[PDB]
Amino acid sequence: RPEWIWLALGTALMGLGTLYFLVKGMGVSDPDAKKFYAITTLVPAIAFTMYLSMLLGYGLTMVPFGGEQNPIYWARYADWLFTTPLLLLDLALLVDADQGTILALVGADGIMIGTGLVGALTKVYSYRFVWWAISTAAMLYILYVLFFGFTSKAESMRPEVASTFKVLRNVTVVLWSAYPVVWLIGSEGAGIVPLNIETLLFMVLDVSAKVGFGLILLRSRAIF
Ligand SMILES: CCCCCCCC(=O)Nc1c(I)c(C(=O)O)c(I)c(C(=O)O)c1I
Ligand SMILES: CCCCCCCC(=O)Nc1c(I)c(C(=O)O)c(I)c(C(=O)O)c1I
Ligand SMILES: *C/C=C(C)/C=C/C=C(C)/C=C/C1=C(C)CCCC1(C)C
Ligand SMILES: CCCCCCCCCCCCCCCC
Ligand SMILES: CCCCCCCCCCCC
Ligand SMILES: CCCCCCCCCCCC
Ligand SMILES: CCCCCCCCCCCC
Ligand SMILES: CCCCCCCCCCCC
Ligand SMILES: CCCCCCCCCC
Ligand SMILES: CCCCCCCCCC
Ligand SMILES: CCCCCCCCCC
Ligand SMILES: CCCCCCCCC
Ligand SMILES: CCCCCCCCC
Ligand SMILES: CCCCCCC
Ligand SMILES: CCCCCCC
Structure with missing residues (x-):
C-alpha cells in the first residue's frame, strides 16, 4: 500500500489540528466563540479517526468493475458524512441562516455523500458515473x-x-x-490517477478544507 505515507501524514496533521483547536478552545470564555470551537474541533477529530483507521488497514474494500478488482477506501465517506455538515453548520451560524435552510443543506449534503458512496461501490462501470453525477449536482446545490x-x-x-x-x-x-x-x-472513476497520488490529493484537500478552514475561522474576531 504505497499510499500509507500520505495516510500517515494526514493522520499526523489531523491529530495536530485537533490538539491545537482543543487547547485554544478550552481557554475561551465567550459563549458564541465556544460553539464555533466545539463544532470545528470535532471536524479534524473525526478526520483523524478515519485517517488512522485507513492507515492501519481498515475501511478498504475491493470492488469489481472494468474487468479488475479495484481498491476503494470507503472510510472516507464515514468521515465526510459527519465532517461536511459540521463545516456547513459553521458557515450557517456565522451568517445566522434559518433552520429550514440548514435542514436543506444538511440533507443535500447527506445525498451528496451517500450517492458518492453508492457510486464508489457500484459494480456496473457506467452506473458509477450516474451516482457521481447525482452527487455532484447535490454539491452544486450546496455551493449555490x-x-x-x-x-x-x-x-x-x-x-x-x-x-x-x-x-x-x-x-x-x-x-x-x-x-x-x-x-x-x-x-x-476513470482510473487515470493511481491510488497513491489520489491519496495525496485527498489529503491535501482534507487538511485544507478542515484545518486550514478551522485556522481562518478560529483566529478571526468574527466568532466573538
Ligand atoms: C485554494 C483556496 C484559494 C481561495 C482564496 C480564498 C481567500 C480569499 O477569498 N481571498 C481574498 C481576500 I483574503 C479578500 C480580502 O482581503 O478580504 C478579498 I476583497 C478577495 C476578493 O474578493 O478579491 C479575495 I479572492
Ligand atoms: C490557510 C491557513 C492560513 C491562514 C492564516 C491567517 C488567518 C487569519 O484569520 N488572518 C486574519 C488576519 I491576517 C486579520 C488581519 O488583517 O490582521 C484579521 I482582522 C483576521 C480576522 O479577525 O478577521 C484574520 I482570520
Ligand atoms: C473534509 C472534507 C471535506 C470538506 C470533503 C468534501 C467532500 C466532497 C465535497 C465530496 C464530494 C463528492 C462529489 C461531489 C461527487 C463524487 C463523490 C464525492 C463524495 C468525492
Ligand atoms: C460558486 C458558484 C456556485 C455554482 C452553482 C452551479 C450550479 C448552478 C446551476 C443552476 C442555477 C439555477 C438558477 C436559478 C435561478 C433561476
Ligand atoms: C469547549 C470548546 C473546545 C472544544 C470542545 C470539544 C469538542 C469535542 C472534541 C473532543 C476531541 C478529543
Ligand atoms: C426548499 C429546500 C429544498 C431542498 C432541496 C434539496 C435538493 C437536493 C439536491 C438535488 C440532487 C439531485
Ligand atoms: C439561494 C437559494 C435558492 C435555491 C435555488 C436552487 C438552485 C439550483 C441548483 C441546482 C444544482 C443542479
Ligand atoms: C502509472 C503511474 C504514472 C501515471 C501518473 C499520473 C499522474 C497524473 C496526475 C494529475 C494531477 C491532477
Ligand atoms: C516504516 C515506518 C513506519 C512509521 C509510521 C509513522 C507514522 C505516524 C506519523 C508520525
Ligand atoms: C485527541 C484525539 C482524540 C481521538 C481518539 C479516538 C481514537 C479512536 C480510535 C479509532
Ligand atoms: C487539487 C489540489 C488543490 C490545491 C489547493 C491547496 C492549497 C491549500 C491552502 C489553504
Ligand atoms: C500546530 C498547528 C497545526 C496546523 C497544521 C497546518 C496546516 C496548514 C494548511
Ligand atoms: C435518487 C434517485 C435514484 C435514481 C438512480 C437511477 C439508478 C440507475 C442505475
Ligand atoms: C508550538 C507552537 C504553537 C504556538 C501556539 C502557542 C503556544
Ligand atoms: C487562504 C487565504 C487566507 C486569508 C486569511 C485572511 C483573513
Whole structure:
C-alpha cells in the first residue's frame, strides 16, 4: 500500500489540528466563540479517526468493475458524512441562516455523500458515473446556496463577519469543487490517477478544507 505515507501524514496533521483547536478552545470564555470551537474541533477529530483507521488497514474494500478488482477506501465517506455538515453548520451560524435552510443543506449534503458512496461501490462501470453525477449536482446545490443565499445573509452582519464569511466561502467553493474531479479521474472513476497520488490529493484537500478552514475561522474576531 504505497499510499500509507500520505495516510500517515494526514493522520499526523489531523491529530495536530485537533490538539491545537482543543487547547485554544478550552481557554475561551465567550459563549458564541465556544460553539464555533466545539463544532470545528470535532471536524479534524473525526478526520483523524478515519485517517488512522485507513492507515492501519481498515475501511478498504475491493470492488469489481472494468474487468479488475479495484481498491476503494470507503472510510472516507464515514468521515465526510459527519465532517461536511459540521463545516456547513459553521458557515450557517456565522451568517445566522434559518433552520429550514440548514435542514436543506444538511440533507443535500447527506445525498451528496451517500450517492458518492453508492457510486464508489457500484459494480456496473457506467452506473458509477450516474451516482457521481447525482452527487455532484447535490454539491452544486450546496455551493449555490452558500454563494448566493449565505452571501446575502452575511451582508446584513458587521463587515468583519461578512469578510470572514467571504474568505471561508471562497475556500469552500474552491476546495469542494476539486473533490468530484479527483474522484472522476482517480481509482473510483476513470482510473487515470493511481491510488497513491489520489491519496495525496485527498489529503491535501482534507487538511485544507478542515484545518486550514478551522485556522481562518478560529483566529478571526468574527466568532466573538
Ligand atoms: C485554494 C483556496 C484559494 C481561495 C482564496 C480564498 C481567500 C480569499 O477569498 N481571498 C481574498 C481576500 I483574503 C479578500 C480580502 O482581503 O478580504 C478579498 I476583497 C478577495 C476578493 O474578493 O478579491 C479575495 I479572492
Ligand atoms: C490557510 C491557513 C492560513 C491562514 C492564516 C491567517 C488567518 C487569519 O484569520 N488572518 C486574519 C488576519 I491576517 C486579520 C488581519 O488583517 O490582521 C484579521 I482582522 C483576521 C480576522 O479577525 O478577521 C484574520 I482570520
Ligand atoms: C473534509 C472534507 C471535506 C470538506 C470533503 C468534501 C467532500 C466532497 C465535497 C465530496 C464530494 C463528492 C462529489 C461531489 C461527487 C463524487 C463523490 C464525492 C463524495 C468525492
Ligand atoms: C433561476 C435561478 C436559478 C438558477 C439555477 C442555477 C443552476 C446551476 C448552478 C450550479 C452551479 C452553482 C455554482 C456556485 C458558484 C460558486
Ligand atoms: C469547549 C470548546 C473546545 C472544544 C470542545 C470539544 C469538542 C469535542 C472534541 C473532543 C476531541 C478529543
Ligand atoms: C426548499 C429546500 C429544498 C431542498 C432541496 C434539496 C435538493 C437536493 C439536491 C438535488 C440532487 C439531485
Ligand atoms: C443542479 C444544482 C441546482 C441548483 C439550483 C438552485 C436552487 C435555488 C435555491 C435558492 C437559494 C439561494
Ligand atoms: C502509472 C503511474 C504514472 C501515471 C501518473 C499520473 C499522474 C497524473 C496526475 C494529475 C494531477 C491532477
Ligand atoms: C516504516 C515506518 C513506519 C512509521 C509510521 C509513522 C507514522 C505516524 C506519523 C508520525
Ligand atoms: C485527541 C484525539 C482524540 C481521538 C481518539 C479516538 C481514537 C479512536 C480510535 C479509532
Ligand atoms: C487539487 C489540489 C488543490 C490545491 C489547493 C491547496 C492549497 C491549500 C491552502 C489553504
Ligand atoms: C500546530 C498547528 C497545526 C496546523 C497544521 C497546518 C496546516 C496548514 C494548511
Ligand atoms: C435518487 C434517485 C435514484 C435514481 C438512480 C437511477 C439508478 C440507475 C442505475
Ligand atoms: C508550538 C507552537 C504553537 C504556538 C501556539 C502557542 C503556544
Ligand atoms: C487562504 C487565504 C487566507 C486569508 C486569511 C485572511 C483573513
